[PDB]
Structure formats: structure tokens, C-alpha cells
Structure 1
Amino acid sequence: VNELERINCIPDQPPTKATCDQRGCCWNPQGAVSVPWCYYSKNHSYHVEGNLVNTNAGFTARLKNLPSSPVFGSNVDNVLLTAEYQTSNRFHFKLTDQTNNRFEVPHEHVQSFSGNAAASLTYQVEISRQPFSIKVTRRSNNRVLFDSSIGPLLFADQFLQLSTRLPSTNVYGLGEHVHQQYRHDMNWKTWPIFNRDTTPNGNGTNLYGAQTFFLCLEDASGLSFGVFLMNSNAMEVVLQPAPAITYRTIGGILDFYVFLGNTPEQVVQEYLELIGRPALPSYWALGFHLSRYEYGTLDNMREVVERNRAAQLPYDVQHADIDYMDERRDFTYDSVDFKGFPEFVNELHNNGQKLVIIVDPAISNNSSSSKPYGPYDRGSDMKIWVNSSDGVTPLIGEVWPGQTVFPDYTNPNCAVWWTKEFELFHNQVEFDGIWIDMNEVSNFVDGSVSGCSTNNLNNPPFTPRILDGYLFCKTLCMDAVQHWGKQYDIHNLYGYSMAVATAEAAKTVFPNKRSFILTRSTFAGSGKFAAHWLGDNTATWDDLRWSIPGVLEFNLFGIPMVGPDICGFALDTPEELCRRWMQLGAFYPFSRNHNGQGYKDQDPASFGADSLLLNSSRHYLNIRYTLLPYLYTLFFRAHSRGDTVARPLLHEFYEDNSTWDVHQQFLWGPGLLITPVLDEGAEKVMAYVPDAVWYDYETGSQVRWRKQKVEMELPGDKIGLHLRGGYIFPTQQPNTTTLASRKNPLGLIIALDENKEAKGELFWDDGETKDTVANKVYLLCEFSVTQNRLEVNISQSTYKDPNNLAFNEIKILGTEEPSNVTVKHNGVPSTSPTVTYDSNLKVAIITDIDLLLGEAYTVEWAH
């Protein structure tokens, strides 16, 4: 055996020969570091029994275990393989127990397949029988994508494992972790997945969410594929340099999907087609968000709001953390420290801003006739709590307010209880959106206030390498009971069900509106309901750096609205770090400055009315706001087609192997390259400039660089921002709120490619109504430049903004002097616009023009 292909047979202890012999595995301690000493033999596991059966959907096979005494509990002697050719580019197979039903994820979006195998498959599937393996190859070039033959299938009641060889080491995805780089380290790495409230630090632990999807770029042609495991039990994923990946889970079934595409963006599109495309955000949620844990009093909160408004900082959203509550209890506010909370909210609204309030899932069980607590009383009447293993007594744990019970959001009546809590509280405080936190679910005691019984659920045969080494650590007992099943099976689904329920609440509380939900814990599919933030980071330069792969991975996962706490939640932030982070932070899809309890202020205005940090912050936030129409259109494409929003360079530049591991730079969509300074003391950044024409965003000048590493000069007040030739970017003059900015004139920036062509598009709707896309109430136009001519072409025209918006400026980059500019409307001329030309920079600006939004125009020039 090649040592890189050994599949570790002793994942559960230090390897020894005795155990190896006992398990019937192979023993060879003569390998390199991390190479498994004890590994599976060539004939371990299952074989196909008899013949495969053609079905309407694909085929089934019966798999029979070649006998062996129990290692990690009761083995499954007869396995059923069911394979479904669901679409031309999506294959589904599951391995179940022939004789017994087992837990299967009750996903809100994925449905079972009915009817017949798709025609025109891009993939071919091959089963081997002695021993069992499954292989998926790309039909066009015979590339083997999925091939399980490298290792055994293991299928015990609490230990399920399958491995696959990979065509390349360009592997991206899995979560939620701090990987520290974007392209996977394939050198014997294990990543546990089990939702858990822990710090996103350098330790490589399981964090708040569970994401099994990864994407593999097969080669420079762009051909790519993805694999998703629909399984919500604690699990770990093991990467090795064969290259290969192994999924090892402690329950449920092995339910896999394989996705093929011609490009990385196509794989993401196929994945999101299956699990659910992300929600289209409220346009205001794309503005800047400010927050902290423990303003302490409303006066303090209002003081921060007011200095940042007086600074003229673009600033749409204020979040209120648990300090607003009465003794950290949901659905109350502190009538002394937060006295006047409703008036303050009116003041936010009057200034065009929005209030987002935190809501935790755990509910104080401290209620008496003397001092009742309505949410507990109402929830108990509805009997909607998670129960102890007895099935009938609500489980008791401890969170912010003290002893608490936990809502069972898998119960349909829990969403009705939850909705009523919000409608009641909203009548007192008119919040605009909801931040759901501690929803792993996070418990300050292990399991419950009485601990956990010793049983195969709380103390399973195998425990993946999760933080602290026990499943119920800082969460619920694994034998706790909910409508969807036992905690052991549904733990990873708690935050997911909470988001579904919260989205359900929003149908009543904000009728017909998208509102905004931000969640900590996620499962596959969570992006359909909620934004995500990367959690309780730290004010260090490492955390700044680690944020970029985190944002990119969540964009693969269909949660494009994701960002960390800008400036760092834990710790006082240094001015230089916070300045650099604010600069980068202006370009995260979710942009929120958030700070932990007790640390020095890190709101931009706190650094000084005339400070460099505040000037640079306002500068780059104004750029962000100017580009909101482009960012919003990217979100429209995520929502409607499944595209990423913050995008790895490799998704556009995959033909260039220099981009395959780039993670200190990223794109907005196809067209905008962001190059932050990420090193302490630095005024330069080593950056890659891909193989395109690029223009400096601010000056419009063409950089000399192309397809090369450069040291980009970036002084204290600068971040690198470059526009890609070939693309047209719609813009709107900024203001300090999106409420106000949406009323301003629009602009186009045309970045010409080598052929003096460019293309772009603009989506426009009312920015807040839910399902404007499904119900087709929007504007979509296309811009295309092909020498001497700009065409504005309208493809969907069912929204007309009543604010009478128009493009009143067109900036053309990389152009020779335009002359004799004409404007035709519906092909009818026409008014002669002003043109300014900078011959040194090759930039033309067309002004004194008024192209109505939603109308077709031709603009033409000579040279």
C-alpha cells in the first residue's frame, strides 16, 4: 500500500498491534509522521449480495457484511444502497439498514425524489461488489470524482464511515471551523463537526455550525464537483494526502449527494439548488451595523449612536445585546437602565436607521403569582419545551438569566408560541430584525442542572474529537427529547429549526417584509432564512486574517451574508488593527462592528472626530454604500441562481493555478478585487493580480500588473480596490443610510477589457418586500459596451421605482477619447452630454445626462 492511502483503523485511541490484530487490520508503524500505523486491509467490509436492481430513479443494491465482532457497537449486517440519478448534474445515494429505519434529517427544503432517472447525465456510476465500492466519474473525460474503494464502508449503529479518493488537492469547504487557510491542508487533518459555543481561535475545534459540503476544483479547465453529506449526528471529517476524504459519523445514515459542474460557481449553484438558495436580504441590512455587548444603559447606547451620526458615518443598523433586557430575560427591557427604550427606537427610525435586538432561545423558569414571567408561563401552557429523557419533564439548564428551559423549535406549536412572544414584545419595542444567539444550543451547565445519565447516547462507543471530549459539554443531554427526535440525532439542527421558526414569526411580526435574521448556529440550508456571523473572535491580527477564509466558506454554504465582529469582539483593539479591520470590514457582505463586555470602545467615532481611523472608515464605508446596487445585484443572483457573493479569486481565475490557494484577497462577484493589509506595521501587501485588465477604483487608472505577484503599496489610510476589465458596475450616490441613499442618482462605471468591451447588470426592486423575485416584481437590466456603443437593455420590467431614479454619470475606464457622444432612447435620438477626458489615465466621464431607470438607451461615441 502507498502510505498516503492508508485508512486509519484506530481512530479512537493510541495505535497498538494488539488492537490492530483484534480488529483484523494491517500493522505497519514504519511510516512518516501522522501516517496511520494501523489501517484497513483490502477486504474488510461489505460485499454486494446478488444482483443490482434497476429502479425508475436509478438502482438498488443489497450489501452484506462479511462477519466481524462489535468494535463501536452493534454492526448492521444487511445494508441497502439506494441510488437516484436525480438530475444531469446531481447524483444521490444513501446507505440505510435493510431491516430497520434509522434517523434521517427532517430537512425543511430537501424533498424525497419521485419519478425517473434524469436523461443526459454528466456523470457515470460504477459499483464494485467484492468488496463493495461506489465510484462516480465525469463522463466527458473519465475523471474519477468520487471513489470509495480506498477504504471500507463501516456501518454500525453509532459508527458510520465512508471514504472517497479525490482528483485533486484543491478542496474547499466543511465547517464551521477556523481553517486559517481557504484551500484545505490535506496532510492528515481531522475536523470535528458538532455545534458548540466555543471561541473561533487557532485550535481547530468544532464551532457553532455544521456544514459537510465541500467543493473540489479538478483542474485548470475549471471542471469541479461537490459532495454533501445529509447527516446531523456528531461527526468528523478526515483529510489525507492520497488525496482522500473520510466522513465518520456516530449516527443516522449515510445520505450523500454528488454535484458536477463546469466551473466552481456551477458546483455551488448545484448544491444550493438542492439545499436552498439564500434569502434576498433587506437592502438596509447591507448597510453598516454597529453593536456592543454591554453599553449598560440606554444613555451610553445613545451616546455612541450620536457620536457616530455626528461623524456622518454610513450607519444603518444598531444592535442591542442582552444588556437591554430586564436581568437578561427575553422579551423584556430594563425599565431603569433602558428607561425610554421605545422613544430611542423612534429616534433611530426617524433618522432612517433600524434596530436589531438579540434574542436567546433559553427562557427563565422563574415565575410566580407575585412576579410572573409571561414567556415561561405561556410556553409552559403550550408545553413546547425540550424534555428530559423521561419524555414529559422540561429539561432544566442555565444560561444568561439563570435556570432556564429550552423551546423545542422542531414542534410546530413552538413557532406559534414564539411568534406570539415577538408580537407582544414588538408592541412595546418596534425592532426591525432579530439576532438569534446561543442556539447551538449553548448551556452554561453540562447537559442539565442535574447532569446527564450514563448511557450509549450521552457516552457513545466513539466520540469524534470535539472540544472537551464529551457530547453534552456546554449543551443539552443527548437523551433530551424533541418533536424531531433525541438530542443525539438533532443537536446540529437546533439553530437551524430556530431560524425556520424565527422566519415563521417574521411572517406575522413584519408582514410581507424580509426583515433580517442573524444566527450563530447553522446547518446546511440555514442561509435560506438567516445571515451568519463568525462569532466571538478576538482583537488580534490572526483573527483579522482568519476572517477571509471564514467568509468565503460561508458563501460556498449558501450563507453569503456573513462577516465577523469587525475590530474583534474579545480584547481592547489597537488603533492600527481596528483601522485595517474597518477598511477590510467595509467589504464584508455582512459588515458589523461588535465588541465584547468591558473592553474599550471600538466604534469608529470613539477614535476621534478627526482621527485617521474615522476618516478612513467613513471613506471606505462611503465606497461600500456607493457600490450597494452592485452588491445587491450579487445577492439577487445568489438568491435566484445560487452564485457566491464574496468570491474566491479561483472561482473566476481557476485557469491560473496561482489563484488556487489565495485567501488574503477576495472578489465581490466577478468584478471587484479587494486587497487588504493584514500585517501589523505594514504599508504594503504581497498580493496576486490575476490575469485580467485591472483599474484602480479611486483613480480609474489601469495598473501595469497582470497575472503576477506584486507588492501593492497601501499606506495607513488605503485598502486595495480594483475593478476588472470587462465589467460594468452600477452605483448610487451614497448617504449615511440606505433609506436615503436609495433616492439618489445612479452611475455606471464601465471597466473596458482588452477588446474595449464590457458587460454588467442591475437588479432593482423595493428593497424590502419578501418574494419580489418569486412573484416577479422587479427590474432587471443589462448593460453592454461593444466599441463606440453602450446599450442599456431591459429584461424584466415589473417594478418602477416611484423616486424617479436615473443614471446621471457614466465613467469609462481604459478608453481613448470619446467624441460626439449621442444618446438614443428606444432607438430615437434624443440633449448632448458633457464629457470630461483624462488623457493621462485614459478615463472618460459622461455627465449632463439622464438615463431613466427601467428604460432602454443606446449611448454611442466615436474615436
Structure 2
Amino acid sequence: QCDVPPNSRFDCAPDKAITQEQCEARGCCYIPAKQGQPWCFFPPSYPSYKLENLSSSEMGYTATLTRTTPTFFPKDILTLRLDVMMETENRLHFTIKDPANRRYEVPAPSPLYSVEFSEEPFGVIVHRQLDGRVLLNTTVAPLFFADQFLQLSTSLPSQYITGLAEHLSPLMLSTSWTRITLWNRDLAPTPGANLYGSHPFYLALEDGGSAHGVFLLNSNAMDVVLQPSPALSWRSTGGILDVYIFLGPEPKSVVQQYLDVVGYPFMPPYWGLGFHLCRWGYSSTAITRQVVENMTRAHFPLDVQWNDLDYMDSRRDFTFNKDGFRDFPAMVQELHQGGRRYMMIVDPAISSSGPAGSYRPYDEGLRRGVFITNETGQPLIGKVWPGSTAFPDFTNPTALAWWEDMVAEFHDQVPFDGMWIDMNEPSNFIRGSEDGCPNNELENPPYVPGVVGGTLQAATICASSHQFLSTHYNLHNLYGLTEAIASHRALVKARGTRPFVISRSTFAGHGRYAGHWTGDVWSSWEQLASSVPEILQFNLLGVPLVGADVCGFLGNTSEELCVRWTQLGAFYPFMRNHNSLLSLPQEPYSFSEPAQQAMRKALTLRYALLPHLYTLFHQAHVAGETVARPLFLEFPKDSSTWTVDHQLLWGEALLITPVLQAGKAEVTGYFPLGTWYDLQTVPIREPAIHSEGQWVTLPAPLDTINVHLRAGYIIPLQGPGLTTTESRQQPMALAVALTKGGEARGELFWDDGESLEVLERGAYTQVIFLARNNTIVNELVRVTSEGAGLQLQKVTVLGVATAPQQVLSNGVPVSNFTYSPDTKVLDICVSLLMGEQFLVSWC
């Protein structure tokens, strides 16, 4: 009975340090590890639930689950209801609930899956129908379902699993007895720690390159434990088991299927894809204006100027000081006059210490009962930047109305273009409240997940504090998401155009409302390298508008680190350089001339690619696609890609291989089977890498980042500007990467860059580009006033093996072309319109 292979032992003492006698008294097996692996584990006969009265419904199954022997946890729920819903051919959904009490809940034709059930011990078994592979099997360990402890386990199909944000780790999670804690926490990113957000989703790869995803729709503090058998255990401190399985079979299909439940990514405004520049320490409008002046003087693109806490009066939301920021409104109006936008920090917590009637956000918040309350029904008071603060309850419909009013009234004073919502874990400088927290089972639960500080109260507010929908215990992991939703709506009402919200704290489904940055990353080579997996991970989780602080936030960047970080950072979907109060300056213009040139080239290339990046965001928004994606999403059948997380793709076609280490003049990266053209051969070293699926060492001097364009793809480009206001007026270009057989395909999505309801109203242009048999044509999917008059002036064709004798545009010899026999590049001058059918030919 105790003859269980070490890697298959499930922990029977997750709650406490246990002796052999206590372990055996629990009905568990005690076998010390020979050097982590649990010493106290469940025998196969450990009491679980028994399935009874399984019955077939329309859309699936229902059953009773009965536990006859209590666990070592208090308040086992001995009778459960199982509901299985076969929702689509790709999506299976099951719940396990208490039928006697409403518990907290987060607010050939055949399916790809088959489901069967173990009776005793109870388990759900999900097979992939096509190849019989076991994807889910919850029979592997007991089902625990107590008031403050849920545990469901499964076998995994492989050692390859990704998800369960937010943590600083490789894209592929370690299955070596790893405890991953989901409890939103203000902490500078470091490995093994619960960070700002919680995404209870994983994607599991299968031998051969198929994949499936599992979402547990549970917002409680949880541990997810991975062991090398391989297997996973969800361990939640409340709510219910609400489980979705997504059958893929392609990894990109798993992600889209997940996003079909939690929401497709919001469409950002075009300007939001430009360069953002911020620090804590721009302590006046004069200094802030000098940042824009200095960037402009040195020909550095900048779409958006930001301020941190500097702008506020005594670090309070919806104020500006009358010292350095007396003329704040004029500053922002002037930014708009120059074609730039403005962003500023907003904290959730509201100063509670001001004289009554002197600070409207608090005074009005008190009147309308917007704040999280304590045992006596008064506002819970903590400490953040302004001192004593109350915390808005963004589950309260009246708090939403209050937040809309405060944002709209402040926007009437200072016409900011979005909100940078920080400290929204929610972060508390003291433990729970100024008054501490009561002694109850929510504050002191029977199972505390592996959170930093060892308590649910650490760096946040009391768990038993009251919100409109439930206790903070159940809602904590949603706090940031609820603020992001409230802020999205507030910005839609205030401005009447697409909202731009960048949030620190997140939850599953965040990407439907807002973007994210990875928080207080050190200015280190390690954090530069760690940013690639984390940006890729957020893309898999439907938050494609993500990036890290370019050059790092904490400490002092070096010039070499800031060159490499700007080079990589230019391929973050959200690109912002941000810097701490105590740091040396790190604006592009603050470095040596050669570092400035490298940084200017990185920004120039990003601005040139913006029509492509915007089209990739359109695909995320309409089809649940990733923007930044790991190689394994695009080449899943090549198992060499599975562990690659220091390279990224933009969409299907652009491979970025950054230097992530000091003192390097070369980088080794994986090239999937195919031809990869060096983007340096496109007017804005091997001209083409011919790969069989192999590692290639590339030259990568300090002034260089390796970027390759996949053969078979066409990229739309636009001319330069220091803003997207300027760049969107420039003529466009195509980069056409031919296959050996002379084929390529690409597309362009164009709209006005900021209106709401564009796709519903049809207020966009959509064009497909096709290369075939020495011709390039456009195919007009939709042509409207927005995009019709886009000028195409240049067509660069890569992989043209012989010099053409003639190049025609609509049947007429072109004004000029150049052909380079060394690089096999054909560069063609044209005068065409994206929205009018053209034919470019050569021979």
C-alpha cells in the first residue's frame, strides 16, 4: 500500500511539519526521501470522494460526490455536486460545488476530448480523442474540499508546462517539487516569490507538438505544486472548483480558446505603441518639458511623456502641487499641441487624514460609502504614499461611479491620455491596517500558501475586510483587475476614445481591459534576460500589451546594459523606459554618442515596424492571437523550440535574438527549419540563414540586435517620425521575404488609431499582400476612408536570386530600382495606394 514511486508521492502533510506517528495516524505512508519529495504521502487507498448517481444531461453530466472519512482539515464538505458541460468541440468545463450552500465564485463532428470518471476514488479522466493521450486524470490523488482548502490533482502529459503568473522564472516551469503561489503582492521581482498578479492557467505540451490548457476559475490565495512524475496539484484556500480544459491541439489554438472564456485583448490606441519615458524625480513641469526637448534635440522618438508621484500635492491622487507643477494643465496642453500624449501615476488608496471638506476624493468617497470597511463598518485605514489611506472597493457599483467622477473631474483640470495604475495589489506599508486585524479564520486560515511574509496580511489589507461582493479574502487577487475595469470605463466616459490603462496588479482576463509592466525590476543583466520569458508568458495569458522598464527601474544602469535593454526593449509590445528616484539618469540622450546611435536605431526600427505591430495587436483583439510569442507557439512540432525563452517572435515572421549578457559581440540562437532573412538588408553578416532547424552563432556587436524575417512573409513599414502623429502621415513600404518557390503573404490593418467600436462600425481598411511568380499584388478585404489614401512608395524583395532586366508597376517600367547581387535584395521605388489594386512584376 505504501509502495509508491518517489516522484508519484502526493504530500499528506502540506499543512505542517509531521512526525512518522502523526503521519500514520492520518492514514498516510511515512518514507523519508534518500536526500522537495514529501516524506508523508497518501497511499492509493487514502479516503477520497465516491461518485454516486452519475446522470446524463443535455450538454453533459451531473453527479453527487460523497466523502465518508473526514480529512485532517476542518469543515470538510462531505456532499458535493459535480457538473460536466461539453461546451464546444474544443472546450470542456466542469464544476465541483456545495449543493447546500452558495460558495464564493469569481464574478467528423465530435469533440477533441473524451471524458470518463473513476467511481472510488473519484476522478475526472480527459483523453485527447485523436491519439488517446491522457491530458487530465484527477484520480492520481484524493479530492479535498473543505471550507478553506480545495485540492485537485492531475497527471501532466509531459515535463513541459507554462503559465501560473506572476513569477520570475523560465517560460517552462520546473516540475522538480515546485510550489507556485498565487497571492498578489508588492515585491520587486525575484525568483520563488508571489508577485503582483495571479493567473491560474497552464498550457501543457504533449509529445509530437499538440497541447492543452487548464484554467481554474478561482481567485483565492493558492499554491500550485508541480512534481516530476509529472503531476500538478491545485491547492486553493476557498471558493469552488471551476475547471476549463482547452483541447488545442496547436498551442496558439489553446491560447485563443482560453481567451474565448476570459476575453480577447483590448485594442490599444496606435500612440500607445510608441516610446514612453518616465521616472520618479521629474519634480517640475520645467524638468518634464526638458525631457521632451532633450529627446527631440537628439532625434529620439517619444510619443508619451509620463510623471510619477512628483506631480501630486503631498502624494495624493487627483491633485497637483502649486510649486513645481503650478502650470501642469498648460504642460499637458503643450504636449498635445506637439502631437504627444501624457500619462501619470494613479494609486488606489485615498488620503483619509486631511481636514474634513478639504479633499474631495476622500470626502465624496466617505459620503457614497466607496471604501473597503472593517468589523465595525468604518473604512479600513492603512498607510501608503500620502500617509493614512482608505482603500476603494472596486466591486461596489457606487465606487465605480465615484471613480468615474474623480477621473472625469481631474481630466477637466489636466487632459491626461490614460492612467498608470500602481500599488494595486493592494499595497499597504503596514500589516493589515493601522488597527491591525481581528483574530478569525479568514486572517488565520487552516492552510497558508507559500506567500512572502508567511501571512495573507503581509504588505496588504486585512483578509476579513468587507467588499460589496465578498470578503477581501475571496477578492484580493481581483483588486488590481477590478481597478483596471473601473479605470477603463472612467477613461471611456472622460475622453470618448480607446482607454490606455497600464496596471501593476493583474488577474486572468486583465488583457480585455488593460496592459501591464513587470514592476520594480533591477537594472541588471539577469533582469534584462528574465524579461523575455515574462513578456512571452503575459502574451500566452492574453496580456500582450506588456513590457519591463527599459534599462531597469531599481539601482543604476550601465551604458552597455541600457544599449542592450533598449535594443531588446524596442521589441516589447509595451515599450517604456522608467527609473527610480535614487537612480542615475537613463534617458537615451544621457549616454555617449555611440550608445545614443544604437538606441536611436532601435527606436527608428520599432517606429518603422509600427504598422506591423498594430496589425499584430488587431489579430490579438479579433482572434485571441499573441503579439510577442515564443518559438514553440509557432514551431511546436520542433521539440528543440520547447525550452527557448531568450528569443522571441513578433507574430509568425519576425525572429529577435538579443544579446542578454555583458561583454558579448555575438549571440547563439535557434533557427527553426526555413530561410531567415537578415532585416539589416531592408532599407530603413549572412544576408539569409538557411536553417534545417539548428543553433546559429550570429555577429552581435554593441550597435546591433539580430532580427530575421521568415521566408514566405510580407511586413508593412512606415516612414520615420519623432511621434506616431508624424509617422502615421509618412509613406509606407513592404518588406517581401520570398520562399525559394517565390511566394509570400502578409497583411495590413489600418484605422484612425484611437476611436471606439471601429470593428463593429467597419471604420477600418484591411489589405492582404501576395507574392507569386515574380509578382506582388494587394487584395482589398475592406477599404474605407481610414487607410484608402495610404501611400506605398517602396517595395523591398528579399531572396531574388538573379538581377531583373525590367521591373514594372501596373505595367509601366518603375522610375528606379536597385538590385544587390551580394544580398539578393531588389529595392523598388513605386507610387501606389494601399487601398487600390496594384501589380508589381520583375523578370
What TM-score comes out, normalization by structure 1 length? Answer: 0.95
Determine the structure 2 residue equivalent to 1:185: 174
Measured after TM superposition, the shift of residue 367 of structure 1 is 3.1
Matches of 2:618 and 2:445 in 1, distance apart? 44
Q: Please tell me the residue identity of whatever aligns with 1:721.
A: V
Matches of 2:448 and 2:661 in 1, distance apart? 38
1:22 and 2:7 aligned:
no
Measured after TM superposition, the shift of residue 859 of structure 1 is 2.3
1:494 and 2:479 aligned:
yes
Matches of 1:86 and 1:253 in 2, distance apart? 19
Determine the structure 2 residue equivalent to 1:648: 630
- Asked if structure 2 preserves the Cα contact closer than 8 Å seen for 1:45 and 1:132, the reply is no
Determine the structure 1 residue equivalent to 2:721: 735
Q: Secondary structure of the equivalent of 1:523?
A: coil
What is the aligned counterpart of 1:341 among 328, 345, 355?
A: 328
Aligned residues: percent identity?
45
| RMSD of equivalent CA atoms | 1.5
Matches of 1:748 and 1:685 in 2, distance apart? 28
Determine the structure 1 residue equivalent to 2:359: 373
Determine the structure 2 residue equivalent to 1:784: 770
Determine the structure 2 residue equivalent to 1:207: 195
1:621 and 2:606 aligned:
no
Measured after TM superposition, the shift of residue 27 of structure 1 is 1.5
Q: Secondary structure of the equivalent of 2:53?
A: coil
The range that moved more, 705-714 or 731-740, is 705-714
Q: Which runs of 5+ in 2 are unaligned?
A: none
What is the aligned counterpart of 2:111 among 121, 126, 146?
A: 121
After superposition, what is the alpha-carbon deviation per residue over 1:337-363, rounded to whole angstroms, capped at 9, x for unaligned? 212111211221122111001111100
Matches of 2:109 and 2:400 in 1, distance apart? 41
Matches of 1:819 and 1:429 in 2, distance apart? 60
**Structure 1 pair 59/705, CA: closer, same or farther in 2 (3 Å)?**
closer
Measured after TM superposition, the shift of residue 703 of structure 1 is 2.5
Measured after TM superposition, the shift of residue 262 of structure 1 is 2.6
1:464 and 2:419 aligned:
no
The range that moved more, 302-311 or 565-574, is 302-311
Determine the structure 1 residue equivalent to 2:425: 440
**Structure 1 pair 98/44, CA: closer, same or farther in 2 (3 Å)?**
farther
Q: Please tell me the residue identity of whatever aligns with 2:487.
A: T
- Asked if structure 2 preserves the Cα contact closer than 8 Å seen for 1:764 and 1:799, the reply is no
Determine the structure 2 residue equivalent to 1:114: none
Matches of 1:438 and 1:430 in 2, distance apart? 23
What TM-score comes out, normalization by structure 2 length? Answer: 0.97
Q: Secondary structure of the equivalent of 2:761?
A: coil
The range that moved more, 399-408 or 831-840, is 831-840
Determine the structure 2 residue equivalent to 1:598: 582
Matches of 2:413 and 2:338 in 1, distance apart? 19
Q: Secondary structure of the equivalent of 2:264?
A: coil
Matches of 1:19 and 1:575 in 2, distance apart? 58
What is the aligned counterpart of 2:831 among 829, 850, 853?
A: 850
- Asked if structure 2 preserves the Cα contact closer than 8 Å seen for 1:45 and 1:154, the reply is no
Q: Secondary structure of the equivalent of 1:693?
A: strand
Determine the structure 2 residue equivalent to 1:88: 89
Q: Please tell me the residue identity of whatever aligns with 1:723.
A: L
Matches of 1:753 and 1:32 in 2, distance apart? 56
After superposition, what is the alpha-carbon deviation per residue over 1:429-463, rounded to whole angstroms, capped at 9, x for unaligned? 11111111111111111111010111100010010
After superposition, what is the alpha-carbon deviation per residue over 1:9-52, rounded to whole angstroms, capped at 9, x for unaligned? 111233431231122111211x3542221111212243434331
Determine the structure 2 residue equivalent to 1:39: 41
- Asked if structure 1 preserves the Cα contact closer than 8 Å seen for 2:677 and 2:710, the reply is yes
- Asked if structure 1 preserves the Cα contact closer than 8 Å seen for 2:52 and 2:66, the reply is no
Measured after TM superposition, the shift of residue 791 of structure 1 is 2.1
- Asked if structure 2 preserves the Cα contact closer than 8 Å seen for 1:835 and 1:844, the reply is yes
Q: Please tell me the residue identity of whatever aligns with 1:213.
A: F
Question: Any residues of structure 2 matched to 1:397-416 within 5 Å, and which?
Answer: 397-416=382-401
- Asked if structure 2 preserves the Cα contact closer than 8 Å seen for 1:388 and 1:395, the reply is yes
1:480 and 2:461 aligned:
no
Matches of 1:243 and 1:282 in 2, distance apart? 43
Matches of 1:239 and 1:447 in 2, distance apart? 31
What is the aligned counterpart of 1:260 among 225, 247, 263?
A: 247
What is the aligned counterpart of 2:510 among 526, 530, 540?
A: 526
Measured after TM superposition, the shift of residue 699 of structure 1 is 2.0
Matches of 1:559 and 1:699 in 2, distance apart? 32
Q: Secondary structure of the equivalent of 2:167?
A: coil
Matches of 2:590 and 2:809 in 1, distance apart? 48
Determine the structure 1 residue equivalent to 2:800: 815
Matches of 1:805 and 1:778 in 2, distance apart? 12
Measured after TM superposition, the shift of residue 173 of structure 1 is 0.9
Q: Secondary structure of the equivalent of 1:698?
A: helix
Measured after TM superposition, the shift of residue 303 of structure 1 is 2.1
After superposition, what is the alpha-carbon deviation per residue over 1:812-841, rounded to whole angstroms, capped at 9, x for unaligned? 0011333433334xxxx5663522111111
Matches of 1:819 and 1:669 in 2, distance apart? 35
- Asked if structure 2 preserves the Cα contact closer than 8 Å seen for 1:367 and 1:377, the reply is no
Determine the structure 2 residue equivalent to 1:238: 225
1:575 and 2:550 aligned:
no
Matches of 1:651 and 1:259 in 2, distance apart? 15
Matches of 2:774 and 2:629 in 1, distance apart? 32
Matches of 2:311 and 2:756 in 1, distance apart? 29
Determine the structure 1 residue equivalent to 2:753: 767
Matches of 1:833 and 1:9 in 2, distance apart? 78
Q: Secondary structure of the equivalent of 2:330?
A: helix
Determine the structure 2 residue equivalent to 1:538: 522
After superposition, what is the alpha-carbon deviation per residue over 1:496-527, rounded to whole angstroms, capped at 9, x for unaligned? 1111111111121111x113100011011011
Matches of 1:821 and 1:703 in 2, distance apart? 26
Measured after TM superposition, the shift of residue 300 of structure 1 is 2.2
What is the aligned counterpart of 1:515 among 499, 509, 515?
A: 499
Q: Secondary structure of the equivalent of 2:407?
A: helix
Q: Which runs of 5+ in 1 are unaligned?
A: 107-117
Q: Secondary structure of the equivalent of 2:411?
A: helix
After superposition, what is the alpha-carbon deviation per residue over 1:291-321, rounded to whole angstroms, capped at 9, x for unaligned? 0012222222222222112111011111111
Query: Which consecutive aligned stretches of 4+ in structure 1 deviate over 6 angstroms post-superposition?
Result: none
Q: Secondary structure of the equivalent of 1:508?
A: helix
Question: Any residues of structure 2 matched to 1:705-744 within 5 Å, and which?
Answer: 705-744=691-730
Determine the structure 1 residue equivalent to 2:283: 296
Q: Secondary structure of the equivalent of 1:51?
A: strand
Q: Please tell me the residue identity of whatever aligns with 1:671.
A: A
**Structure 1 pair 47/388, CA: closer, same or farther in 2 (3 Å)?**
closer
After superposition, what is the alpha-carbon deviation per residue over 1:665-686, rounded to whole angstroms, capped at 9, x for unaligned? 1100111111111111111112
Question: How many residue pairs align between the two structures?
Answer: 835
Matches of 2:595 and 2:94 in 1, distance apart? 53
Q: Please tell me the residue identity of whatever aligns with 2:9.
A: R
**Structure 1 pair 722/33, CA: closer, same or farther in 2 (3 Å)?**
farther
Determine the structure 2 residue equivalent to 1:110: none
Q: Please tell me the residue identity of whatever aligns with 1:75.
A: D
Measured after TM superposition, the shift of residue 800 of structure 1 is 3.1
Measured after TM superposition, the shift of residue 495 of structure 1 is 0.8
Matches of 2:10 and 2:350 in 1, distance apart? 45
1:836 and 2:818 aligned:
yes
Determine the structure 2 residue equivalent to 1:167: 157
Q: Secondary structure of the equivalent of 1:635?
A: helix
**Structure 1 pair 167/460, CA: closer, same or farther in 2 (3 Å)?**
same
Measured after TM superposition, the shift of residue 270 of structure 1 is 0.3
Measured after TM superposition, the shift of residue 587 of structure 1 is 0.9
Q: Secondary structure of the equivalent of 1:483?
A: coil
- Asked if structure 1 preserves the Cα contact closer than 8 Å seen for 2:767 and 2:835, the reply is yes
Determine the structure 2 residue equivalent to 1:554: 538
Measured after TM superposition, the shift of residue 572 of structure 1 is 1.0
- Asked if structure 2 preserves the Cα contact closer than 8 Å seen for 1:123 and 1:138, the reply is yes
After superposition, what is the alpha-carbon deviation per residue over 1:598-631, rounded to whole angstroms, capped at 9, x for unaligned? 21101111114xx222111111110001001111
Q: Secondary structure of the equivalent of 2:603?
A: helix
